[PDB]
């Protein structure tokens, strides 16, 4: 078994055997960082790398094969220099890149980075997970007062020890298309990178493959965003997840989808609190103007969205519908907390179907519309509460449908004075506290219009169901010929009342005439009651049997409406019939 | 450290001192692959198994001790055959069954498969996961023609470097009752096996256990299913879970739930693209009939659907409800599409209740109904779209009832044309686009059907509650005798309208009479209006007080309608008392 | 390369070279446990602490260090003892303590413990795990009458290894406030202590900090509960996740969460089936009264709750609302399974707002209140099944309102006779078999209340919307002067009646008066019909144009009720204007 101190004291020793073992110490001798295990290939005359093929210098032929434990590979192993610091601005992109792609080459699994700042950009590639070292974590406290006392006492919080910046300009981690399944973890994105001391790098993660995953990452600086996502067409990018990763100050938003589907936030936070950083929006769910773009299928869980004020800066969450598949963005906030002056923002130039809000919490205005004339067209906003820190309102320059259901929340301090959403939307039963406008619970959803408007048949029943009384209504245009309007039921006692409704000045109708029918199964008998009946601008009627004939007396009076009442002991006569 | 060449080598070497290091480089010598680390045990009696036993030929005691690693055993170092070729038709069963079984019988974990061909069948084991390797990953492109072209430059995709054979025609991997957290990733499983080159193995993975995962797996090519889950009465099949996983062409279904509960496809396909090779449906949850086979709490999460046309295949999806607990299968497409000729069938024989289907897009019909007379009893199809790109119908010889609610979906040139669907379901708002039968909003559900029939007490009332108007209505079999009908409350104004409603021909009740009372605190005054009253067949009127009385005046005209309005102040007097 | 037999002897063996490699047989000699790899550093002066710094006795500078690989941490490698009885009282606490700490300083990870009984306290530390053994698992039956036979063939079920203690009566496993990412798995907690064979320890895990994760772990014997959620003012605890987990007999609770949010149990079971155990409750959500505590988001999908009846066990599964932020507890059963005595205790003083349970199966009642007087205030009860197999009643003691929806339920024997829930809350369709009693569909939600009472406006249209027919009545209290009541509008036709609705003994008003209006577009006639007016107790009634005025004759005879009937042809022209 062959020890060495380095790879470059591996570099001056030759295998004994085929596959002979040989184990460094470290990759650059007195590191401690960097050690692996190799295996002797003496007819080996590929091409040095500094990490899976070490050629012998003092051989023509031969080289140590770098063996990889456990699908993990430590940067380290490929001479990526460990534990620097910020100020020390060390390009170590090709190092990083190369254990990205051979990794990938091998069938995929983790490339593990130390603590430091590592100053390297990095295209994803599949199944290939970028992953760092937290800082050593030292509780404070005893168990006895951890116990104990109410206050806390374990004051230690957990600290990330892999800080990742750029080389350049563009992005620290590059998702191609047709990346599926890469990921990165337990690490700090930073903004500071190569060769600009005053313009950060744009992206942190930029994403354009399929099925990316990220745990633990928290992103701070970035001219751009933290994260971007924006995938090309006939390409997946679907199904990414984060969860525990917080995006922090961003020139421009701290996270942006673009071009997506089927995304989800767990534990999550968005966070603009360096107001001297000035910004663009908070979170931005915005598909480019004019292109292929879409998202939609995005779920925030217990995220937290949290601003300041910052010169220039709108405090938004946005979300834009923009040629999703079935028009609905399907973008769902559950149990999140909009702190500051984060609110929401409806960027839906053709209306924002379906929109969720539940059991979330509001430090300010829950939406806040910046164009005028965008409409939210349905929804459920429920088991909300808006805290009222800031501003009382509901919302800002909003428009909604009755289709937008406002249900189980608690309004603290919430006005709707002079807000027309409390006109259009639907209210269930909802909690006021403090100086709130009370609502009244009204519905206004469109399935139950029906209930709402004027029916086209009105009236009452006995509990036995043997006796109807049914009343309908029509508009007639009387001429001076006897026309046949309508037809009463057998078996049923019936008044007809008719007067004028006309438009025409002085020369209209003027009538109110009550007719009155009653049957048997064969037998009519009939009355009148003229209340009214201008000589000159009246009604006229005449009976054949059952059958009503009206006509006007001068044309100028024509307009007229009937009403029918019927009393019958069987809903089969208990209409009249219309002709 | 002793180091040898094989295994074969390592049964003719001792070991110098208790627990000496010894590595082999390769399992078999020469192949490269296999090679593992083992402990000398000079008092070991144990049987040599060519895997954890390696004994010393020739000798009473002595073994080396295999060391596994991170609980990951690579099948290679039982003497696995890795690299082959599909044409090498090599039962390795015995091999691969000897990993699993060990790694089960020292706490579980991961048996790592190589890359290549591999005819083995495998029976799973508690706790333990079967793994492949992916095939090398080399991306195409530069990052800036990544990042600046919108068409696809990256244009190379992952590939499975393990595909896993049966050594027979039953199953690949067959997870048995009790088996819990068991699990197989990253790897493609294939129909042909050996023993036959005409009939394909049956199943892919056969699930009769509990808690099993699947990540990154495609099944192609078996005879029966490339999924197959039915569970044992009194044991656990529940809690499964599927990622990321592509269930391919199939002689009878891609995939079928038969017996379990609490599934869950994320990101998943289902595709019969074969038409050459005959299949029966796509995917399939069918308990069989007349056993306790059930199937319920299923959630399919943005997956597709997808088939083409193919003699005597039909394209559906099956659901089946039988023998539920709650009588729900509890089945949700979420996010899914389906493409080609890919619809839902309905097959619950007693009605599916609470279907759900939310943003899906549909190529073709949503449902097709192939038994005549089943019901989709309720449910919810929201925000889906279908693109009539095929057929142009809405869905096929399937009946729903007013429960089934349908909004906010985007009907592209559906036609609701002879289809009963539309005269049963409950509408919501949805978009019609190109020459879509446009279905105006309409309630049709039971929780509301109260407000469609006729109330038993209709009226108005003042918005400040201080005027009622109440009307309500009986029907009255008189004879010659006075009869006490009705008592009219105090502080109130009545209008009492009687008459006829008689079934008898020609000597039957007519009569209209209008009567009226108006009441303060004690003191009642009555008048009536006989509009009508035939001498011998209408009615006859009395007041005691505020007690109304009745009476016929021939017995053939028997039959009256009574109907009151009522005026009041209060709504304690708002009601007469019906006698 | 060196090897030694054991920690020991490293201590008396100085490196040759930096960073030579030693290897030790096992921690303590002869016991095959613990061995390890360290590396020689001749000037380390720091402290030897049994685990990553082995000092060499007798020197002033050098020591091994511990090499740890792919983040797993051994506890043997510590000198942790290994498959002890337990009947071995042998306090391991100072060594898992000094392992789970020595893996927070290097990043995190995974302490591994070995099989046996461990005696052993621990405070977690931020993103470490510790994770034991299972036990071998060794499978019973053929493949053969696996497939074939529909009995259970299969008997061998999975155990766990590693039975996890306490070395005192407080807890096993502590998660101090600020502790993020910590977890268990793959292990078994017993309450049995040291230090006291009558008084077990308190706690399984007790949970104080954030993000922590549980999977395959059973908690039993413990003396107050085997999980307890409890957090601190100020710090996060929450979205915690266990999943496969048996909270089992408990001398309190089997589990309790008391201050904390968005916490997910899937395919968890809680069962106290051990009555000789006297014990409190089954599960239990419950800030502690007048404090900060409250619990909110909280999910339990696929578990199971048992209890059997055991002396002053009440065998419930309570939740508390308390100070939760958006007044709901957010708690939801899904797909869950309420075996023998368990049901679902409403302990929320403020109402139960938005209670979930859906695809629940009940042994006995699914609601037993035991504080008289608390309410469901609204939710969801959907597609559950009452067995019926105990109690024959849907609930005790409880009491809900119109916007708690019961529907698609099987209500299997359930009796609703005497019990309010029948007459107060809003049911669907709902499937009622055996002798259940059939509760009729009735709608009672709150957001509907409108088409239930009186409307304020009454009548009826035409289906071509040119004839209209409205009704709005009011409440007039007269003097002896005329009072403007009303107007008419144009184009239309007015029946107005008015009549005495006085509370005045003897002189009240008395009157039954009818007005008609006709107007065209600029020209009004009326008409009158007095059927009752008295002389002394009626009205006057004045027409100025289309204005109506109104006085009494006696003060006395002062309360008055007007209803005006329109008739129009335009819904501009028909309601007239209350003055
Ligand atoms: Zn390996
Ligand atoms: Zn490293
Ligand atoms: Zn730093
Ligand atoms: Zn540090
Ligand atoms: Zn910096
Ligand atoms: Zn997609
Ligand atoms: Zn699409
Ligand atoms: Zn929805
Ligand atoms: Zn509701
Ligand atoms: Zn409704
Ligand atoms: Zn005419
Ligand atoms: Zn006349
Ligand atoms: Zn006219
Ligand atoms: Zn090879
Ligand atoms: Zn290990
Ligand atoms: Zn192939
Ligand atoms: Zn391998
Ligand atoms: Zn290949
Ligand atoms: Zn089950
Ligand atoms: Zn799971
Ligand atoms: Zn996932
Ligand atoms: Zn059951
Ligand atoms: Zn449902
Ligand atoms: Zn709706
Ligand atoms: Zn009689
Ligand atoms: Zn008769
Ligand atoms: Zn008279
Ligand atoms: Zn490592
Ligand atoms: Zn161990
Ligand atoms: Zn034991
Ligand atoms: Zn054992
Ligand atoms: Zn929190
Ligand atoms: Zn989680
Ligand atoms: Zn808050
Ligand atoms: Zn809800
Ligand atoms: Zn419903
Ligand atoms: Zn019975
Ligand atoms: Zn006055
Ligand atoms: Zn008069
Ligand atoms: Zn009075």
Redesign the pocket.
């Known amino acids: 078994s062959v020890q060495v101190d380095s790879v470059n004291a591996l570099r001056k020793v030759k295998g004994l055997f085929h596959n002979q073992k040989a184990t460094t110490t470290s990759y650059v001798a007195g590191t401690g960082f960097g050690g692996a295990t190799y295996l002797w290939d003496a007819n080996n005359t590929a091409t040095d790398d500094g990490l899976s093929v070490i050629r012998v210098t003092g051989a023509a032929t031969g080289a140590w094969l770098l063996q990889v434990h456990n699908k993990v590979l430590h940067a380290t192993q490929a001479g990526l220099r460990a534990e620097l610091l910020?100020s020390d601005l060390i390009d170590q992109t090709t190092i990083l890149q190369k254990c990205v792609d051979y990794m990938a080459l091998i069938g995929g699994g983790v490339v593990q980075l130390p603590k430091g700042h590592i100053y390297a950009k990095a295209m994803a590639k599949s199944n290939v997970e970028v992953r760092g070292t937290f800082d050593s974590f030292v509780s404070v406290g005893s168990e006895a007062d951890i116990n104990n006392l109410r206050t806390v006492v374990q004051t230690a919080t957990y600290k990330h020890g892999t800080f990742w910046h750029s080389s350049d300009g563009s992005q620290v981690y590059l998702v191609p298309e047709n990346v599926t399944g890469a990921g990165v973890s337990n690490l700090k994105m930073?903004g500071?990178r190569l060769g600009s001391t005053s313009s950060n790098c744009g992206f942190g993660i930029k994403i354009i493959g399929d099925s990316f995953t990220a745990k633990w990452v928290d992103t701070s600086?970035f001219r751009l965003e933290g994260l971007y996502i924006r995938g090309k067409d006939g390409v997946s990018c679907s199904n990414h997840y984060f969860e525990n990763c917080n995006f922090l100050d961003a020139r421009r938003n701290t996270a942006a989808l673009v071009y997506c589907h089927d995304v989800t936030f767990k534990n999550c936070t968005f966070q603009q609190l360096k107001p001297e950083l000035t910004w663009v929006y908070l979170f931005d769910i915005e598909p480019n103007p004019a292109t292929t773009d879409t998202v939609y299928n995005v779920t925030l869980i217990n995220c937290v969205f949290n601003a300041l004020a910052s010169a220039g800066a709108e405090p938004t969450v946005l979300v834009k519908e923009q040629n999703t598949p079935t028009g609905s963005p399907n973008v769902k906030f559950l149990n999140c907390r909009f702190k500051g002056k984060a609110t929401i923002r409806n960027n839906c130039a053709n209306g924002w179907k379906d929109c969720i809000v539940d059991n979330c919490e509001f430090d300010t205005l829950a939406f806040s519309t910046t164009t005028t004339g965008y409409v939210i067209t349905s929804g459920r906003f429920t088991n909300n509460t808006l805290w009222g820190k800031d501003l009382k309102g509901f919302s800002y320059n909003t428009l909604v449908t009755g289709d937008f259901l406002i249900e189980g929340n608690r309004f603290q301090d919430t006005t709707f004075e002079n807000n027309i959403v409390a006109t259009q939307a639907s209210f269930g039963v909802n909690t006021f506290l403090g100086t709130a406008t009370v609502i009244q619970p009204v519905d206004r959803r469109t399935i139950t219009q029906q209930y709402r408007n004027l029916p086209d048949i009105s009236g009452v029943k006995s509990p036995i169901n043997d006796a109807y009384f049914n009343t309908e209504i029509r508009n007639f245009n009387l001429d001076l010929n006897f026309k046949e309007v309508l037809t009463v039921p057998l078996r049923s006692g019936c008044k007809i009342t008719i007067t004028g409704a006309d438009a025409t000045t002085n020369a209209g109708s003027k009538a109110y005439v009550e007719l009155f029918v009653n049957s048997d199964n064969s037998t009519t008998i009939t009355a009148h009651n003229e209340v009214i009946n201008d000589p000159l601008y009246g009604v006229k009627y005449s009976w054949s049997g059952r059958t009503l004939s009206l006509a006007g007396i001068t044309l100028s009076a024509n307009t007229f409406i009937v009403k029918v009442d019927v009393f019958s002991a069987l809903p089969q006569y208990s209409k009249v019939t219309w002709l």
Do not use: D, I, V
Request: charged share 25%; glycine share 24%; no cysteine.
């Open positions: 910020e930073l500071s600086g």
